[PDB]
Symmetry: D3
Subunit: 173 residues, 6 copies
Amino acid sequence: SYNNIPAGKDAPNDIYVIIEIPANAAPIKYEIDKDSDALFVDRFMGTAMFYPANYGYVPNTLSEDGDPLDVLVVTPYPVAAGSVIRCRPVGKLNMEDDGGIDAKLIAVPHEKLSPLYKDVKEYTDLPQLLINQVEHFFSHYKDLEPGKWVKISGWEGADVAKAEVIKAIEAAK
Amino acid sequence: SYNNIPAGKDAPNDIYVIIEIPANAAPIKYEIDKDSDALFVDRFMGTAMFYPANYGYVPNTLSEDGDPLDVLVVTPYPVAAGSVIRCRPVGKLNMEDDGGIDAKLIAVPHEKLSPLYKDVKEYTDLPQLLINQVEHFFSHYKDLEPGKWVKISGWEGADVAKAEVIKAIEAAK
Amino acid sequence: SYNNIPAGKDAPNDIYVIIEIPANAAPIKYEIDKDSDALFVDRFMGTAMFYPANYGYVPNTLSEDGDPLDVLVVTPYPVAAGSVIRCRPVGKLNMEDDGGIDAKLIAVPHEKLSPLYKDVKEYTDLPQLLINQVEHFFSHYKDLEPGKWVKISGWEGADVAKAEVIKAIEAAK
Amino acid sequence: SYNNIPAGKDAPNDIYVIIEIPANAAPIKYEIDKDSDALFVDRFMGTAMFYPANYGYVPNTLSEDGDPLDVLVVTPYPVAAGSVIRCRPVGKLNMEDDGGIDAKLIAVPHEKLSPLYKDVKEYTDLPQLLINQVEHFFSHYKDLEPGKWVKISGWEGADVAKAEVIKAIEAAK
Amino acid sequence: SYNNIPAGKDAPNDIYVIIEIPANAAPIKYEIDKDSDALFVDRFMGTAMFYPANYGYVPNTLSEDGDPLDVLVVTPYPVAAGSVIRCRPVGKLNMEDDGGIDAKLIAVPHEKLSPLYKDVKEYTDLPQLLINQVEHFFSHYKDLEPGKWVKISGWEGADVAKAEVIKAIEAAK
Amino acid sequence: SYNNIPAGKDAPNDIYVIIEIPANAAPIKYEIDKDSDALFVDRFMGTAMFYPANYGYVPNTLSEDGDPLDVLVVTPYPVAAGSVIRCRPVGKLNMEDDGGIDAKLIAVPHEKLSPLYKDVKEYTDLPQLLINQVEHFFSHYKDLEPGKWVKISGWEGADVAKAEVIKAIEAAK
Ligand SMILES: [Mg+2]
Ligand SMILES: [Mg+2]
Ligand SMILES: [Mg+2]
Ligand SMILES: [Mg+2]
Ligand SMILES: [Mg+2]
Ligand SMILES: [Mg+2]
Ligand code: NA
Ligand code: NA
Ligand code: NA
Ligand code: NA
Ligand code: NA
Ligand code: NA
């Protein structure tokens, strides 16, 4: 089951992300049901938007919102919903919403999976337009869900994102 | 596992359906293998038809044919095979086949998932053409499987469909 | 060629729309090149958005912006880019942008093509969420194109939309 | 334009078919508008069916129904709508409908395009299930269009299909 | 879980294959993680190639390379990643690589799933071009993975492939 | 028609490419028929490969092989077959085949279409893996077409590619 997957083979530098929503997919928000391991349809998204990168969580972590830590994973082609990507954080996007504050990490595939991201050490090494798309997506994807808003605060770098992984790991135990 | 999912959060009005065949998909009939929870290919369909809505079953139910209770779930876009939709029955389609009688419920997503079906209380609140497509699909999708036929009997409403959910729940215990 | 297609078989009630961008498609903005009739890639869209309905124009019309009159056409499944839909206006969405003002009509397929929209006489007969998605899409799809903004003004009904078709037809001669 | 394409490089054995509806596609019936060469949406199909092979017509031919001669073309993967396949008839399917009688040829790609059909000389050299799917498709695809019915009469072979191509060619002049 | 699936309902003639990579899919190599049963992204493939048939393994088997026995399964349409096909071996492809030797079986769906392969008893009953595509795919798909090469040795028939299934079954206990 | 499209708005730095085969598409080789402007199926490709970038030609040019000059165009998402991309050459790939020598240019979208390639001035500014994929694709995509082989010679830069555009333009007059 998904519970058997460690937060990573090697901590913050070498982590696993279980993908719930593929990049470039239909506007269906899935979420792994923790009791059953099944992919639940959580929402048919209102806005006509798509996730600019694969979206999921690091197993065996806990964030402030009671869910595991959220991560976007950039890949050369979208991966299957429910599949698991070995990856490496390169940044952290901070935001405020209607329920306080939120954050999403961004990660790239481990070099065992692809050579394409060898030179991507910080989120600023990704295409500037991709970074803008991610900011714009999280700023607006809930605009048609009543009582929901999101304001983008700003980014922090790979080191701070990796620190967030470690904090979420300890928080889960 | 799928066995951990209850028939619903709240009985006949708020139920779960595990999707085996997405709407508008390739003509592959999948079926969840109960021993393993895996999606098995049960048949490469003979006819050049597709399911007009997502097709699956309510967990922890038992119908007359020894399988869990069958449900079609209407959604704004097809969901992933094996995913789980929180939904609400709005009708029941009765049929005769080569092995006696059969029935399929039709359901719409719970309001937590989408506002689009708030005003859909009965199957007659859905587009008349969709209802016709569903009747025509079940009437003909097995036409090229030898020894198989299906005749449509007629529809019953949301209340009777919900009664069928409760009967199938008790039958499973 | 596209120039041979009349604005419609029967004026404002029965019109043709040449689709440039299908509903639910990749974020590529095509535009028909009038000299060649070819589909040109006009822009790889910055935002992670998709058109909520098929987008195109009425041939042999002229709008204030020197291009033919713009129309969104709702269909049960997205149509091919460059294909031509016989349809009927049901509304007009007014907006302001960086270059003044703009408007988009919304239309449904002619009854010869589908019975699904027989009861859709006004844009308010469409799902309220679809209308919201259209407003939100045009409000934000150019957010990542520098120097571009759009503010939604409001909607007018089918009669006013049809009047716009007639005005654009006369303007083209 | 499509009018510039001959019925074939070499008569009945080596012909061109302009594809209007790809195999395995959404249930949208396109038709080439002869005045403009554009792909028109002719119908959003009622039944939940798909064409088992690519569907189109032989240019510069005329059938009894005032349209060019209809052909299904089997291919290893569906081709783009509006594209043109060099092919070779292998059979003719006869039917009765509400307007009298109808027929559809079936063809395979020319050996210049693929070696896969070298041994397919007659429609009976194709998979028996494919032939059944084609019969079942034409028998039922108009079941939800009011006042439409189709009854399958039977098949004739490659030679008779090729004779039909020649008759339709002469009929167009 | 996948571990609950037997190598087959009936040995070498009637076996199960868990599909990791669908036919005709994006160039993402998935692999089932045995500890968790989850689909892991193992590699974003370097070459611009796709698997000519569905790729996976027979559960409860063990090959020389410490992984379960590899099988390609031919189907009329690609199946979902992670789904399970009841099938029957028809051949065995032998190869040498950088780590010694390797082999892949090829199988067709059980007659309960489809009649299309009733007459396919040996791999030489499949289209010759498909067999060539499979040879060419395995010969070249790792060409852009550093230090990887594959040379095709040749094929053996259905009986030898079935013997390989039995050997791998005993090896797993 | 396509003949009305100039080789470019501004010569070698600002050119048009008519796409015949989209990136990441089914293995169908289309070719624009010059007499009719229609997209012809030229070949169902034997190898299980896909074009790593959109493939087409510069209108109103002539290469040594009697066809217009060939170009690969890199885009963030594949474009529709038959569509036209405003782009800019960044490199030239030289090869030998069974009929002597061949070459393919590689280009990126004009800045009016996307900001993503502003810093891509030479083919060596693209991902090294993409360049390898292109070399490997042309080296092997005809391996299963009898009597066809291709050997890669090497690359030249943007300036030489642009010189090739000018030579092909003059050659067409
Ligand atoms: Mg969260
Ligand atoms: Mg049942
Ligand atoms: Mg405009
Ligand atoms: Mg006809
Ligand atoms: Mg192996
Ligand atoms: Mg050439
Ligand atoms: Na809101
Ligand atoms: Na039957
Ligand atoms: Na802006
Ligand atoms: Na009828
Ligand atoms: Na290598
Ligand atoms: Na060869």
